[PDB]
Design a protein around this nucleic acid. Structure first.
Lengths: 493, 471, 600, 140
RNA sequence: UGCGAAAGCAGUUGAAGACAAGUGCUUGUCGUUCGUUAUAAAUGGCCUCGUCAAACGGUGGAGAGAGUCGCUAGGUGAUCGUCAGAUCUGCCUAGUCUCUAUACAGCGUGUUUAAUUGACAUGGGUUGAUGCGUA
């Protein structure tokens, strides 16, 4: 004996642009809340530690959003002029920010009242202030003064090192993982300058030409650095010092770029790149940086970020707009005497000699139409086919199964105009689609052969056939057109 | 199976058995075991019995027994279908039995088409033997001489219900071809699904192709991809040839039609499925089911014989080489290259050996007296086989008659060294040899219509111990 | 695979030792280290002139020259680049013998002269290997001694193979370990083969064997990938390492015709299972696996070309199929001048595609069985036909049908024995010569139905049969391999409707659209226009043929006025074509009170 | 189970103002579906012809691919889009001829068109039966 | 039935004996033969072992649903009418635009390329069957 086969849902040949496993994961960023801010949100960053609250810089203020609540929990408004960054330290205890005045303020994250260290980096605005990932103490600062001073938290009065050489605004600083000595900066000159802090410094080790003003530089991996500038982003390798790839799908100038690796997605690593065209799209580094998904937003996107790898909860996708609109998308993640009377159920037989299991696994409950085919209820299985809110694919099967079983006339004997109308109404709709066109062609012929006389005396059915006769005719015209195109193509090739 | 309780006229059931129950019995002092005989009427060519012994306690197969289950192209000897309420394809009515028996004897005696050859395959990794039974594949171990598995490779009403009366006229999908890649991990199947009768779509056969895969430890093949109507609509896939080891590391195959098309499929890791890598246009309206296909060990060139003409197609261009066109006296049956040098081409009248290097036929042997029209096109493919090291074999079977033909047959194997210069061996068996193919070691296996797989190849203590054992 | 034209590297000096063209090659030594696939430099030792280094590309030039006295003969020469105690340096090692009295082993180091050294070798130096990693120079002497020296020519280790009169020694690397095998002649055509591995003793003997029947005096030897190649009396003998066992013998019929003494043969390898052979001024590229001549090139402007060395491709690992070889070319004339010439070689893909049909090696139906079961002399005939008087049709048919026992005027399955192609070719020649004009024998009708009708006669056959309507009709229906060109040209020139339809059917059945489409393009535009007119005035394939015509014409060529007439015609056909279809499908397809009168 | 189905024809791996060209070239380059869809929304055949006339030949190839996937998913849009496809094939016929490979880069068109054209004989058979019965009762 | 392509191209379905029924005659039948390649219909349908909830991983999707008198292109109705148009601020189909747990279908998570847990005493008895919910 053998268990009964489960009826096999029909699957017509794959059509173009099928849903890919990458897209299925990223479509789960469903819940969308739009918040409005006074000015353009310039920079967004995530706390590396639990609960991974993320900071957003807008106008003269920095706001920290709880991960679970998705609402402001701390506000830093002490800054007099605009603020330009909110990067966390690796530990996540501190928060550093810059000003147009040029001062760099280090606050204790989650204690906005206390200011730990204040540094007068330069008289010009201080756009980028990043902590060093490997080393906690050293803080980097970039100014429109075109010098990227390397600060130390212990000694604030003088810089530990003062990298220079850029002939334009520096707005991008990156630290290469596993090479703490190395520092990577990008200017609007179109050159990405790499420096070594172990050496004397103040002169770049070598420059990589990007050919357009560089808007952000991100070190994707210890040997690869991806830089987004102008209308494209190019990934560079330092060992060879040449570009492995470049992608120009974007239209407006890319502005921000972020990277995340080793999260529960099918795609191991993701590169999200803002567009300034309202787009923020995902690229896959394991696949030569090919696109896999994208979102569109109302205005240009000036900052992007995704929750870190160790999110430990609902994931977040955050984007920033020049209109001040902030868009968040989230992937949500008896009595004792009785118990003593029955205490054996927990046991799984770890100490026993012989373990014997015979329980058959529970199968998914079978739908009504399958129950009727299995019990040989041919006519009812047809009725269940046409019921309100029945998925189209499932209905097409129970027509096919009956035809495959050889029960087409048998399912249509005891029927009149009252109970034949549902079949024709589906057929009126099924005839359009390519997949069900052959099957509807088959059933429609039978009911005519079997209800010719009934059709004459029933006026309602007569209309159903005129309307059907109209649409089948319309289908002929479409198919005839397709042939002419097909012939047209063969001429070209 | 129905157990009728006669006290209350109730019943208990054991359904979905492998075949119709010819016989039942209760075998034991306390009715411990039920013994059943099953028929598997699907195979109309032969009577494929299977003996079951079920434990009465839980109605589960205590012992299942069956011989090899090939499917021959036509009925053999005196096989007669069982008795049904109606005359159908799979059964005989009350009256039709005697008349069908007479027609069967007259067909075996008078007619001239006597092709009972059956397709079979040999698994490289395991050397199990794969039988393409109707709508299923039966995996049989001939070293141990037992069946190991029986898997349904098609859709259709296979075991969902027991066909009765008119339903019995339905034809389940038929596995026409089944082949393995050289590496032995991929299984290719080609199937024809027959539409029901008396409908509009009752003349458009559906050609399906499927790719399966399994690990060595596992025993069930898993379907990995499915192509519906390859090469177009209603156009058969006459031939399947798995690729040699060189190209894609044995992860590809060629399929050939009756219209002259070649489709080269390969396994793409990025996609993780098989995909149609190369194509040739089957456009010219010359139709013939007689097509031969061979592939050189290197994988560079392909030999495609269609009707009476052989073509040499480069693999890189998938087009004629830039002599590639060879005409034969008649339509080609089999094209095989015994070694990289020599190509052995069989036509309906003769067989020949040709040097690709010289392009000159060396030896030609006349087959017409033995093979004239007894075999349909493409079954000589399965009668002839070629080793990869030593040489090839030709199998020729003939009817024995004394004073009009008689049902009994006699078979003869002929071992040919490469290029057919010498006969290494000559042998004769006393029954129709259906298939002979090359197992991958030196020996060859062949199948007889008796379903017999033959092989052609190169002190007081001592008493106390006895008394203790007796007790 | 193809051979490039040789290009001169240098002109050999006019020295007496080099005056002997047969022995000229032995006096020119090529360094193994510098001439490979990826190097652009060639270091050469010309006996009595110098040892010189040349750059090949972009143009040949001389980079360095070390003069040698005219009385010295360069027996071995090898040069390798490396680092020596660190400075990048080029180490040159060459061995000379002066009148056989004294043997010289010299080492020269050049900064990329840093140093030059010289010692007296005990015997003739035959092979030198320079190990730049270990700064060791390893020399092989004819007396069997293997001496290991440092770059200062201080002897470090010496190993004797226990045999004298060494004749062949070759270096090869396997899996990162260096090796050498040495062949020593013995008496009675016996040869001592010894395999040595280079590593307390740096040299280890791995194999030693005695080979019988192996002669040297008329044998040319070369080695490639564990296989030793011996050319002797036109037979190539393949021995395989490490045991130097004979695997295969290849007979080369071209060399069997060479008179012994006059023809100058040189034999060097170029790739896997592929070698280069030269016979006087003709060059061959051979595939030894399949026994095929990949490419042949004749140098008409040189009397003889002698190989010296070739750069060998590791084709199983290398995507490059192009390499280079160096040889000595000697010109014709009373004062012959020898020149060094380089030849570029395209070995190919090492695949059966290259070798198909190019073998250098140069039928009657046989009953399958020699001996109660159901059954389901060409030359003489040719001679009889040939004896016939011209235009004697009756005798010709009588002889052909009666001798061969042919029963039908058309070929059948019962005439398989006649299917020997040559006899058909001769009979066809007989028919043409004996018969001309308007009367041809019924034999031709039988041959035209023969499936093995020769391809040599297929051309113009339609023209020959143009006179007779019946034979022409017979050709179209059954004559195999009729050229598509002639069918097409005849298709659009005929005005007869019946022949038009069948030619369409024949053209469609035997040819793909892609092949037909190209030929229609070659045609004149008037003819397609004329054919298109016949349409507007079994029709299945004729329409499908028109669709082919339309595509070949292309977009640009078609004309609007003619197009509209077509546009009208096709619409009429579609209206009809639709119309028949519904016809075809159609063929396949109580009262409360009522009045009635009783029947009483 | 989860095995992919497919078919044999999936050859995937083998002048006037109001013209919307500028929006179209951007929409295809950036793969902006929403922006593209506004462009496809217009239906004036004079506008369709002028857009495709000035569209760069390189972009036309992906346009056919983009229209192809739209048609395959949404059958009802066969009519309106087919004029775009017809016009793209007409204007850029010369360039399309000089392309290394067409089956791979236009596989979706061939897949879509082949599916429809196969249905034609079946539908004609359905039409004939309906005319037989419709004529019958209308007369009666 | 033969040949062939799958399409089709040709060709068949004869004679005797016996029985049953109705009235020697008529029809139907054959666990009878010879010869030729040669409707159905005895009220008659497939077992039990464990269910439910909630996840997760791939495979498909005509997406499952709700809005926008916001656009584009059609089709078309009621009454009146000076045939130009009016009122229903008309209706329907399709595309588009906005949104949601991809909300929908399916295979698996006894080891697989990938991927799971949790609840229950899987019992007996009593009431309601005009059951419960909704119009």
């Amino acid at each position: 004996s053998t268990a009964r086969p489960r009826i096999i849902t029909s699957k017509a040949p794959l059509l173009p642009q099928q849903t890919t496993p990458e897209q299925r994961y990223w479509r789960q960023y469903t819940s969308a809340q739009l918040v409005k801010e006074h000015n353009s949100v310039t920079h967004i960053s995530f706390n590396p530690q639990h609960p991974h609250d993320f900071a957003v810089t807008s106008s003269t203020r920095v706001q920290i959003f709880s991960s679970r609540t998705r609402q402001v929990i701390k506000t830093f408004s002490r800054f007099k002029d605009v603020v330009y960054s909110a990067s966390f330290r690796s530990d996540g205890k501190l928060l550093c920010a810059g000003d147009a005045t040029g001062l760099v303020s280090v606050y204790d994250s989650y204690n906005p009242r206390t200011i730990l260290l204040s540094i007068n980096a330069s008289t010009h605005p201080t756009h980028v202030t990043k902590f060093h990932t490997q080393d906690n103490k050293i803080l980097a600062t970039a100014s429109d003064d075109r010098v990227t001073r390397l600060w130390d938290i212990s000694n604030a009065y003088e810089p530990q090192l003062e990298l220079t050489g850029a002939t334009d605004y520096v707005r991008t600083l990156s630290f290469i993982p596993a090479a703490p000595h190395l520092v990577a900066t990008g200017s609007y000159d179109g050159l990405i300058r790499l420096y070594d802090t172990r050496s004397s410094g103040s002169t770049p080790i070598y420059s990589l030409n990007h050919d357009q003003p560089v808007e952000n530089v991100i070190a994707v991996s210890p040997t690869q650095i991806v830089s987004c500038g102008g209308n494209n982003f190019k990934v560079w390798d330092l060992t060879s010092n040449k570009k492995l790839y470049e992608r120009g799908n974007f239209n407006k100038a890319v502005t921000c770029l972020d990277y995340v690796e080793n999260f529960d997605s099918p795609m191991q690593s993701a590169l999200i790149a803002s567009s300034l065209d309202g787009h923020v799209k995902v690229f896959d580094p394991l696949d030569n940086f090919q696109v896999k998904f994208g979102w569109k937003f109302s205005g240009p996107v000036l900052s992007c970020a995704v929750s870190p790898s160790t999110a430990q909860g609902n994931r977040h996708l955050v984007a920033g707009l020049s209109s001040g609109l902030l868009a968040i998308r989230t992937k949500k993640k008896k009595s004792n005497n009785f118990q003593r009377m029955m205490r054996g159920s927990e046991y799984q037989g770890d100490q026993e000699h012989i373990i014997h299991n015979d329980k058959v696994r529970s199968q998914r409950r079978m739908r009504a139409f399958e129950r009727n085919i299995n019990q040989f209820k041919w006519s009812e299985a047809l009725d269940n086919a046409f019921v309100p809110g029945m998925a189209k694919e499932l209905t097409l099967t129970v027509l096919q199964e009956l035809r495959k079983r050889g029960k087409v006339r048998v399912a249509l004997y005891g029927r009149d105009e009252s109970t034949l109308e549902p079949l024709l109404n589906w057929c009126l709709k099924g005839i359009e689609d390519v997949r069900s066109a052959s099957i509807v062609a088959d059933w429609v012929a039978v009911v005519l052969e079997l209800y010719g006389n009934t059709l004459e005396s029933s006026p309602v059915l007569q209309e159903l056939m005129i309307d059907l006769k109209t649409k089948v005719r319309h289908e002929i015209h479409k198919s005839k057109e397709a042939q002419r195109i097909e012939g047209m193509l063969q001429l070209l090739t | 199976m129905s157990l009728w309780q006669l006290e209350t006229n109730s019943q208990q059931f054991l359904p979905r058995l492998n075949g119709i129950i010819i016989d039942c019995q209760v075998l034991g002092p306390q009715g411990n075991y039920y013994s059943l005989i099953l028929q598997m009427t699907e195979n109309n060519s032969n009577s494929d019995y299977q003996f079951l012994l079920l434990n009465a306690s839980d109605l589960t197969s205590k012992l299942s027994i069956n011989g090899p289950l090939p499917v021959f192209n036509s009925t053999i000897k005196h096989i007669q279908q069982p008795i049904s309420a109606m005359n159908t394809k799979n059964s005989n009515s009350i009256t039709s039995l005697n008349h069908s028996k007479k027609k069967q004897s007259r067909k075996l005696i008078k007619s001239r088409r006597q092709d009972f050859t059956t397709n079979v395959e040999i698994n490289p990794i395991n050397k199990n033997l794969y039988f393409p039974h109707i709508s299923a594949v039966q995996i049989f171990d001939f070293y141990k001489n037992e069946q190991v598995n029986y898997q349904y490779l098609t859709s259709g009403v296979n075991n969902s219900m027991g066909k009765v009366r008119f339903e019995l006229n339905l034809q389940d999908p038929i596995i026409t071809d089944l082949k393995f890649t050289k590496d032995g991990q991929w299984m290719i199947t080609y199937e024809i699904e027959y539409p029901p009768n008396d409908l509009l779509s009752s003349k458009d056969l559906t050609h399906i192709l499927k790719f399966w895969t399994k690990n060595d430890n596992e025993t069930n093949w898993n379907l990995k991809t499915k192509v519906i109507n390859p090469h177009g609509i209603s156009v058969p896939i006459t031939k399947i040839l798995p690729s040699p080891r060189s190209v894609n590391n044995s992860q590809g195959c060629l399929t050939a039609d009756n219209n002259g098309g070649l489709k080269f499929w390969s396994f793409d890791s990025h996609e993780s499925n098989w995909c149609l890598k190369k194509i040739s246009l089957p456009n010219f309206n010359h139709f013939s089911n007689s097509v031969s296909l061979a592939w050189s060990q290197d994988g560079s060139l392909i030999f495609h014989g269609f009707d009476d003409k052989l073509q040499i197609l480069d693999f890189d261009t998938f087009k004629k080489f830039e002599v590639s066109e060879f005409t034969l006296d008649s339509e080609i049956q089999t094209v095989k290259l015994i070694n990289d040098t020599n190509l052995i081409v069989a036509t309906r009248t003769t067989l020949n050996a040709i040097n690709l290097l010289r392009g000159q036929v060396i030896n030609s042997f006349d087959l017409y007296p033995f093979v004239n029209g007894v075999y349909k096109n493409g079954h000589m493919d399965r009668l002839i086989t070629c080793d990869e090291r030593t040489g090839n074999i030709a199998l020729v079977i003939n009817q024995q008659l004394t004073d009009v033909p008689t049902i009994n047959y006699k078979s003869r194997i002929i071992i040919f060294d490469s290029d057919l210069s010498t006969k290494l061996g000559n042998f004769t068996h006393h029954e129709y040899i259906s298939w002979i193919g090359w197992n991958y070691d030196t020996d060859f296996i062949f199948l007889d219509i008796e379903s017999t797989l033959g092989v052609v190849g190169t002190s007081n203590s001592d008493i106390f111990a006895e008394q203790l054992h007796k007790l | 695979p193809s051979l490039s034209q040789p290009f001169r590297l240098a002109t050999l000096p006019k020295i007496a030792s080099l005056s002997n063209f047969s022995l000229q090659a032995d006096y020119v030594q090529v360094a193994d280290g510098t001439f490979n696939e990826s190097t652009n430099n060639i270091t050469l030792g010309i006996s009595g002139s110098s040892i010189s280094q040349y750059i090949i590309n972009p143009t040949p030039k001389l980079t360095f020259d070390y003069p040698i006295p005219s009385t010295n003969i360069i027996t071995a020469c090898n040069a390798e680049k490396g680092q020596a105690n660190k400075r990048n340096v080029e180490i040159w090692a060459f061995g000379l013998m002066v009148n056989k009295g004294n043997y010289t082993l010299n080492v020269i180091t050049k900064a990329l002269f840093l140093s030059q050294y010289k010692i007296k070798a005990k015997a003739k130096v035959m092979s030198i290997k320079i190990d730049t990693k270990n700064s060791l120079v390893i020399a092989i002497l004819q007396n069997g001694l293997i001496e290991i020296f440092d770059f200062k020519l201080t002897l470090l280790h010496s190993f004797d193979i226990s045999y004298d009169n060494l004749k062949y020694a070759k270096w090869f690397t396997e899996n990162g370990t260096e090796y050498v095998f040495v062949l020593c002649p013995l008496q009675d055509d016996k040869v001592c083969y010894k395999l040595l591995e280079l590593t307390s003793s740096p040299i280890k003997e791995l194999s030693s064997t005695i080979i019988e029947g192996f002669s040297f005096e008329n044998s040319k030897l070369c080695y490639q990938f564990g296989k030793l190649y011996k050319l002797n009396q036109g037979k190539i003998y393949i021995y395989s390492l490490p045991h130097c066992q004979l695997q295969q013998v290849i007979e080369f019929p071209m060399v069997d015709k060479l008179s012994p003494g006059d023809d100058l043969i040189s034999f060097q390898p170029v790739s896997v299972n592929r070698v280069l052979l030269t016979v006087n001024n003709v060059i061959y590229l051979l595939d030894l696996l399949h026994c095929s001549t990949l490419s042949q090139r004749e140098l008409t402007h040189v009397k003889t070309f002698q190989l010296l060395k070739s750069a060998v491709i590791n084709s199983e690992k290398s995507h490059n199929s192009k390499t280079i070889a160096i040889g000595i070319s000697t010109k014709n004339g009373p004062n012959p001048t020898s020149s060094l010439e380089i030849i570029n070689i395209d070995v190919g893909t090492n695949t059966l595609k290259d070798s198909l049909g190019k073998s250098f090696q140069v039928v009657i139906l046989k009953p399958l069985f020699d001996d109660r079961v159901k059954c389901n002399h060409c030359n003489e005939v040719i001679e009889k036909l040939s004896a016939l008087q011209d235009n004697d049709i009756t005798s010709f048919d009588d002889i052909f049908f009666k001798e061969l026992k042919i029963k039908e005027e058309h070929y059948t399955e019962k005439d398989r024995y006649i299917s020997d192609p040559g006899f058909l070719n001769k009979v066809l020649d007989l028919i043409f010569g004996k018969f001309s004009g308007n009367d041809y024998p019924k034999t031709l009708t039988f041959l035209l139905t023969h499936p093995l009708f020769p391809l040599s006669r297929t051309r113009n056959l339609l023209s020959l049969l143009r006179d007779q309507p019946r034979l022409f009709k017979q050709a179209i229906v059954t004559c195999p391999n009729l050229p598509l060109n002639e069918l097409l040209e005849e298709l659009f020139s005929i005005r007869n409707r019946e022949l038009l339809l069948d030619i369409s059917f024949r053209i469609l059945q035997d040819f793909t659209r892609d092949s037909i489409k190209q030929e229609m393009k070659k045609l004149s535009k008037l003819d397609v226009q004329n054919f298109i007119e016949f349409i507007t005035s079994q029709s299945t394939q004729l329409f499908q043929l028109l669709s082919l015509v339309l595509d070949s014409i292309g977009l640009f060529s078609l004309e609007g006025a003619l197009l509209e007439n077509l546009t009208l015609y096709i619409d009429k056909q579609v209206e009809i074509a639709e119309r028949n279809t519904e016809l075809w499908n159609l063929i396949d397809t109580l009262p409360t009170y009522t009045m009635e009168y009783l029947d009483i | 189970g989860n095995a992919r189905v497919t078919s044999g024809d999936n050859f995937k791996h083998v002048t006037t103002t109001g013209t919307v060209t500028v929006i179209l070239s951007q929409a295809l380059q950036s793969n902006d579906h929403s922006l593209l869809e506004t462009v496809l929304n217009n239906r004036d055949e004079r506008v369709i012809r002028d857009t495709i006339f000035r569209l760069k030949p390189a972009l036309a190839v992906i346009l056919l691919e983009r229209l192809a996937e739209r048609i395959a998913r949404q059958t009802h849009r066969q009519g309106p889009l087919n004029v775009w496809v017809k016009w793209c094939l007409i204007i850029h016929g010369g360039y399309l001829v000089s392309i290394p490979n067409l089956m791979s880069t236009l596989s979706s068109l061939h897949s879509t068109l082949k599916r429809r054209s196969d249905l034609l004989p079946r539908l004609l058979a359905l039409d004939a039966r309906l005319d037989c019965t419709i004529n019958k009762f209308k007369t009666l």
